C-alpha cells in the first residue's frame, strides 16, 4: 500500500511513476482499494467518457465529511446530476462573473485606505476575508462584520482538510457541521418568508430548486450545495496568492502586464492556473468493462486522473515546468490538455462550473496588484510544498510599504 507514499509525494505521486515506468498508466493499491492511475490529455478524454466512468461512490467518505459534504453533486451521475449541475451553472454565467469581479474590484479599492495605513499585510488572509464577504453578499447570505473572519476560516479549514491526516483533518471535520447548521437555518427561514431573498441569487435558487421529481431539496442538502458555492469562491485566495507569487519571481512580466491590455492579463491568469498546483487528481469508478491503451479496466475499479501531471506534460506544453504566459497568445484551446479545474464540458460532465468566476476574479485581482498599488515584498519564506495539498507560499505572501497610484 502506497497511501502513505501518496501523502508523502503529493502532486508528484502519479507523475513520478509514469515517468519511471514510461507508461501513461499503472496499477496501485491506494485507499485500501485497487486503482489505475493515469495521466495525459488522451487519458482525460477517457476519464470524461460518462458511459465508462461513474462518480457515485467514488468520493472517499473522509473527504465528504470535511471538504465537500455528504451526497452532493460530486457523487451524482446520470440525468439527476445534469439536472442539479444546471442549477450551479445558472449561478455562474458571464453576468454573475462580471458581478463578482466588479464587487472584488470595489473591495480592493477600499482596502487601499486601510493598507496604506498598515505596515505589512498578508495577502492570503486579506483575500479570504474579502472573498467571503463578497461571496455571501452576491449570494444573498447575511454576514455580520464580526463573524466574517470566523466564517472564512471555517471555509478554508474545509478546503485544507480533504488531503490531510490528524489535526489538520480534524479542523475541517469540525468546521463542516458549523457551516451546514448556519446555512440550513437560513434555508429554513427563507422557505418561511422570515428572511428576505431575491430571485436569481444563490441562496434563493438553492432554497427553491426543484429536482426532476419536483420536490425541493432537504434543507441540509440545500445548505450543502450552497456551501459548495461559497467555499470554492473563498478558495480562489490560493490562486490569488500564486498570481502575486508569479509577479514577484518573474518581474519581467509586470511591465509586460502594465503596458498591455486584457490580452496579457488573460494569458497570465491562465499560466498561473496551469503552472501552480491546486487540485492533484480526480477519482472515478469504471462502471462497465472496457480496454484502452492496451490495458483492461474491470468494472468497479477505482481510477485516478493526474491533473497536475497533465498540466506539465511536455507532450502538451513546451518547457512545461517553466512559467511562460506567452504560451497562450492566440493558441488552440483544447478541453483536455489544460485541466486545472477539470476537462471536457461542464454541462456534459463534472468539470468545474465556476471556472469563469475563478478567472474574472483573478483578472480583476491581478489588475489591482499591477495598476493600483506599489508594494515591497519583504524577506519571507515563499516556499510552497508539492507535498502539501493544497499548497501555498508558506508566508501567505506578505506585502509592505503599500501605496496608492
Ligand atoms: C478556486 C479554484 C478552483 C479550483 C482549483 C476548482 C477545481 C475544480 C475541480 C477539479 C472540480 C471537479 C472536476 C471533475 O469532477 O471532473 C470542480 C468542481 C466543482 N466546482 Fe470548482 N474549482 C475552483 C473554483 C470554483 C468556484 C469559484 C466555484 C463556484 C463559484 C466552484 C464550484 C464547483 C462545483 C459546484 C463543482 C462540482 C461540479 C460537478 O460535480 O458537476 N469551483 N472544481
Ligand atoms: C479519489 C480522491 C479524490 C479527491 C479529490 C476529489 C475532488 C476534488 C476537486 C473538487 C473541487 C471542488 C470545487 C472547489 C472547492 C475546493 O477546492 O474546496
From Swiss-Prot:
Top-rank EC class of the record's enzyme: oxidoreductase
Catalytic activity: a 1,2-saturated fatty acid + H2O2 = a 2-hydroxy fatty acid + H2O; a 2,3-saturated fatty acid + H2O2 = a 3-hydroxy fatty acid + H2O; tetradecanoate + H2O2 = (3R)-hydroxytetradecanoate + H2O; tetradecanoate + H2O2 = (2R)-hydroxytetradecanoate + H2O
UniProt keyword annotations, A-Z: Heme, Iron, Metal-binding, Monooxygenase, Oxidoreductase
Matching Gene3D superfamilies: Cytochrome P450
CDD domains: CYP152
Pfam hit, one: p450
SUPFAM superfamilies: Cytochrome P450
EC number(s) per entry: 1.11.2.4
InterPro entries named in the record: Cyt_P450, Cyt_P450_E_grp-I, Cyt_P450_sf, Cytochrome_P450_3A
GO molecular function: heme binding; iron ion binding; monooxygenase activity; oxidoreductase activity, acting on paired donors, with incorporation or reduction of molecular oxygen
Cofactor section: heme
Keyword Iron recorded: yes
Amino acids binding heme: 352
Function: Catalyzes the alpha- and beta-hydroxylation of myristic acid in the presence of hydrogen peroxide.
Family designation: Belongs to the cytochrome P450 family.
Name of the molecule in the record: Fatty-acid peroxygenase
Originating species: Bacillus subtilis (strain 168)
Amino acid at each position: 500500500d502506497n497511501s502513505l507514499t501518496l501523502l508523502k509525494e503529493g502532486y508528484l505521486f502519479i507523475k513520478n511513476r509514469t515517468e519511471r515506468y514510461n507508461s501513461d498508466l499503472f496499477q496501485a493499491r491506494l485507499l485500501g482499494k485497487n486503482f489505475i492511475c493515469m495521466t495525459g490529455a488522451e487519458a482525460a478524454k477517457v476519464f470524461y467518457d460518462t458511459d465508462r466512468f461513474q462518480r457515485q461512490n467514488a468520493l472517499p467518505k473522509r473527504v465528504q465529511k470535511s471538504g465537500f459534504g455528504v451526497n452532493a453533486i460530486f457523487g451524482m451521475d446520470g440525468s439527476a446530476h445534469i439536472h442539479r449541475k444546471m442549477l450551479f451553472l445558472s449561478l455562474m454565467t458571464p453576468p454573475h462573473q462580471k458581478r463578482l469581479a466588479e464587487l472584488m474590484t470595489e473591495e480592493w479599492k477600499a482596502a487601499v485606505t486601510r493598507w496604506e495605513k498598515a505596515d505589512e499585510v498578508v495577502l492570503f488572509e486579506e483575500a479570504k476575508e474579502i472573498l467571503c464577504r463578497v461571496a455571501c453578499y452576491w449570494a444573498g447570505v447575511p454576514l455580520k462584520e464580526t463573524e466574517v473572519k470566523e466564517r472564512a476560516d471555517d471555509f478554508i479549514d474545509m478546503v485544507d482538510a480533504s488531503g490531510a491526516v490528524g489535526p489538520r483533518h480534524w479542523k475541517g471535520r469540525r468546521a463542516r457541521p458549523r457551516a451546514e447548521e448556519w446555512i440550513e437555518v437560513m434555508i429554513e427561514d427563507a422557505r418561511a418568508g422570515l428572511l428576505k431573498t431575491t430571485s436569481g441569487t444563490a441562496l434563493h435558487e438553492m432554497a427553491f430548486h426543484t429536482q426532476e421529481d419536483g420536490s425541493q431539496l432537504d434543507s441540509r442538502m440545500a445548505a450543502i450545495e450552497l456551501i459548495n458555492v461559497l467555499r470554492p469562491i473563498v478558495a480562489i485566495s490560493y490562486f490569488l496568492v500564486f498570481s502575486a507569487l508569479a509577479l514577484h519571481e518573474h518581474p519581467k512580466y509586470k511591465e509586460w502586464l502594465r503596458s498591455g491590455n486584457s490580452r496579457e492579463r488573460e494569458m497570465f491568469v491562465q499560466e498561473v492556473r496551469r503552472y501552480y498546483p491546486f487540485i492533484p487528481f480526480l477519482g472515478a469508478l469504471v462502471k462497465k468493462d472496457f480496454v484502452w491503451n492496451n490495458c483492461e479496466f474491470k468494472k468497479g475499479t477505482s481510477v485516478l486522473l493526474d491533473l497536475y501531471g497533465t498540466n506539465h506534460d511536455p507532450r502538451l506544453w513546451d518547457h512545461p515546468d517553466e512559467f511562460r504566459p506567452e504560451r497562450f497568445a492566440e493558441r488552440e484551446e483544447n478541453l483536455f490538455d489544460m485541466i486545472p479545474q477539470g476537462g471536457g464540458h461542464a454541462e456534459k460532465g463534472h468539470r468545474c462550473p465556476g471556472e469563469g468566476i475563478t478567472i474574472e476574479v483573478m483578472k480583476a485581482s491581478l489588475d489591482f496588484l499591477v495598476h493600483q498599488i506599489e508594494y515591497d515584498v519583504p524577506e519571507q519564506s515563499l516556499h510552497y510544498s508539492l507535498a502539501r495539498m493544497p499548497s501555498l507560499p508558506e508566508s501567505g505572501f506578505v506585502m509592505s510599504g503599500i501605496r496608492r497610484k
